[PDB]
A paper describes a structure:
Inosine 5′-monophosphate dehydrogenase (IMPDH) is the first and rate-limiting step in guanine nucleotide biosynthesis, controlling the gateway to guanine nucleotides. IMPDH catalyzes the oxidation of inosine 5′-monophosphate to xanthosine 5′-monophosphate (XMP) with a concomitant reduction of NAD+ to NADH. A monomer consists of two domains, namely, the catalytic domain, which is an eight-fold β/α barrel, and a subdomain, including two tandem cystathione-synthetase motifs (CBS domain or Bateman domain), which protrudes from the corners of the homotetramer. IMPDH is also a promising target for antibacterial drug discovery.
Author numbering:
A (entry chain D): 6 to 88, 206 to 224, 229 to 296, 303 to 369, 421 to 466
B (entry chain C): 6 to 88, 209 to 224, 229 to 296, 303 to 369, 421 to 466
C (entry chain A), D (entry chain B): 6 to 88, 206 to 224, 229 to 296, 303 to 372, 421 to 466
Write the structure that this text describes.
């Protein structure tokens, strides 16, 4: 059987730290570190110009969706770079990413010094998706690209071979097509090669609570991508309230789970985390 | 340990295909090819002229029922045969019979397929029925069912069946049954060795179930409840061209997920992922 | 793990038997044959004299409950034995069973010619039940005794060694005590020990539909006992979920059992228990 | 996989004891035995001084919660000590426990003759908890200490080596943090270490009925800690889900445990923990 998040629990280990000295910083790329290991999804109802700023200012990052345009989209990302310990570049302008489709229109995004461009679709192990990655690194080599989605160690190596710096893993698609893979097994399948290729992992899908974020990060993911749980908010274009209240609930939940396993940072979190397999009577 | 459709998931493979050159056509017998691998079940609340002509115009096939009295059954096999496509350009259709004299009038409307439809195909009365049909009408294609074992499949094949149909209230009343995914897989090797197509009958609710059944070895899928509320039928689904286009759209999408251009590549490339009880 | 009825399915087999000419009769004891392999439970909402007569008329058997006083229970047995394929004794009277607990009942029940005494207890594998079975057979050797309930092989051996002619295999007790055993595994764990001793088995509990009766019988039990499925009928006590005539409820159960044996290609219960194969179904295989 | 209470069932064994003469007393420490193996949790909606008095009078024990101020908690303990099978100390006064959370409590609570100090926290396998245990044992060596909660054999030995006389094993945790352990496997993972160390185990969490209490004790627990099941009682804090008199609630689970030991054929808790066999049940069995 392939495991999902509800199939396992984190085993409590000896601890000598408190959720006060606990670091949740994650290093996704070479010169790219998030204080909050959370990315916003590329949906029209989620990450806009306002939510992208709220994500960067809270310690994370948001990516701008493709259903604006090429150029009506660059108006959204350039606003983010107009503006505590937020995540911003050497220039001091807040980090931000943008979702792209599969000739490419990344020039107008790179000219605004985009921090990341996201080539994401339903099937990351495609050939037109594979050649879209080499197309972007051939034109803009210094630019960093995240590719997805893939649920296999084979698809991860294909995207890594194409030059992807980060990969994305990950329902109506299960019902309409019958295609899918439980997220926990998919995450663990693609990180044993990604940890040897030096490539970070963004888990996209299956995140319902903050406990699922703890399991995804403990499985080997450097960051999680969240969309539906950031939809009914003020900063987004059901009702959630302020964005900083939602993310603080996730940050606090992730910090408390690390205190259960006795980890002060994410590196040792993934080194001592142990999954207990629970029965169907998991309530 | 016996798997149904909901116990598995198709694993995504590397793909260079896009749902524009995807061939969902399939053969069910010699000189019998359906552009849509979907047949309409033999429910008297489903298949008649309005639905059989619609199933045939969409690229599939319909089975006009035997709940009709015998003279009204052939009178509706006549209604479909006069305006997919046979040798003479007539819209192909099928008809169901029970356990052989009533098949004579069905041959003289030049029906394209006769379905010996019962709930327990692995029985002597069905074996004797298939032998009697191929004796008086050997140029007549016979689909027989329903079975769910390799032994029942070989018994029908040995009796002269050209197509095997594999197939709840029967589970509650009798306690007898078999999960469809395991039933399909237990029959394919006996059917592929004999060159006999398999029609998956029952357990289909979504378009993903059609993709799993075909990937498991089925040459065609027979749906009934999902075509009951349609207009071309005697809830309310609406136009039958829209529900059928959704089925083919979902099948083409999953075949693109595994990287298959046609159905034969689909059945050779597909790999099933066993999913846990919580993985739903 | 231990499996229940919903964990398995009967596999279809080759069949040349038509469901009309299928014999579902069973021999629960020497010179004791039921044309309907169904017994009514000893519950005060199920089996009085009116339902026991209806159970006996349909070819089954009724077990007068012991919530009746000992004098009331004797009067209810008398009303049954004074009233086509009906369960009748050698003198042509309808047969009936009577439930006793673990002196003031067996004697009076024996002289009103009760056909079977049922030592009904939630835990048949106990010293009290073994003493009761021994004392009943010591004083009334010509009286058939069914003991229960047990769920293990060692429990079945204790009742057989105590002299029980029939053993009964069998939720609030699960939640209150945490004790229990899935009925399918309990039946299978007992039938190899029981049939070696020539003792029939009555499956008691877990029967929701006629398909469960087929599985229990195919697993090895000679007869099933149902309770709540007969609670809302006319012959059931009270004046009330109303279920209608008991004959149609029992006709539905016998119809599903005959249709099930047709899928397996069996003509009688012995062939059913020899041809039947179980297919283990997954959690999603509802 | 790791099993919870709903994953297993107790197997029926041969029995020669009636639940009338079944001894459910348990020993949690030296010169500290409870006639009812039940302890009320340290929750503000559960254990008052009134509820703790009702717990000690029924044969159990109460753990005064620590959402009281330290002065309030000392007054609640005073009211219990100054107030049949009741759990009393050498001076004939009702016994009571009190919870602390890792300086201004243990002293004053020792002065009012508290019978047990409970170091209660969500993660007992931590340095702050181990330091709290060793310092209570340093200043108050004659004071019994229960520490928790843990769920592993490793975390159990850390508490025992720190000086804990009783170990506590054990919602919102699994969804907020993704951390947890099924209670049945957690209890069975500690009994080996605790038995060789001579310390008793208190099962805290996952108990919904009296059957879970029997399974927890059969798995090796000396006592269980229930909370929500006593929250809406007469003696519980609040005013008027109302559940009624707590003596009737405790009478129900006391009867459920006794009959569960009758199925296994045990007259005391020790025989219950040796004769008990667990049956793994299917997903369809629940």
């Amino acid at each position: 059987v392939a495991l999902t998040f509800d199939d396992v629990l984190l085993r409590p280990e000896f601890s000598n730290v408190l959720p006060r000295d606990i670091d949740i910083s994650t290093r996704i790329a070479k010169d790219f570190t998030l204080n909050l290991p959370i990315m916003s999804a590329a949906m029209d109802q989620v990450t806009d110009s306002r939510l992208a700023i709220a994500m960067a200012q809270a310690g994370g990052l948001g990516v701008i969706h493709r259903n604006f345009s090429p150029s009506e989209q660059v108006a959204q990302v350039h606003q983010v770079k107009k503006f505590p310990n937020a995540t911003k570049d050497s220039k001091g302008r807040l980090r931000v990413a943008a979702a792209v489709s599969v000739a490419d229109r990344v020039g107008p995004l790179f000219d605004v010094n985009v921090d990341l461009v996201v080539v994401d679709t339903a099937h990351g192990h495609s050939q037109k998706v594979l050649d879209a990655v080499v197309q972007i690194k051939k034109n803009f080599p210094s630019l960093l690209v995240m590719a997805g989605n893939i649920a296999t160690a084979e698809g991860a190596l294909a995207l890594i071979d194409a030059g992807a710096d980060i990969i994305k893993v990950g329902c109506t698609t299960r019902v309409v097509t019958g295609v899918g893979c439980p997220q926990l097994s998919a995450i663990m399948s693609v990180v044993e090669v990604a940890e040897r290729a030096g490539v970070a992992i963004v888990a996209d899908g299956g995140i319902r609570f903050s406990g699922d974020i703890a399991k995804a990060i403990a499985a080997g993911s450097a960051c999680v991508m969240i969309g539906s749980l950031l939809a009914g908010t003020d900063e987004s274009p059901p009702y959630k309230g302020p964005i900083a209240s939602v993310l603080h609930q996730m940050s606090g939940g992730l910090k408390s789970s690390m205190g259960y396993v006795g980890a002060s940072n994410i590196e040792e979190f993934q080194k001592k985390a142990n999954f207990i397999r629970v029965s169907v009577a998991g309530l």
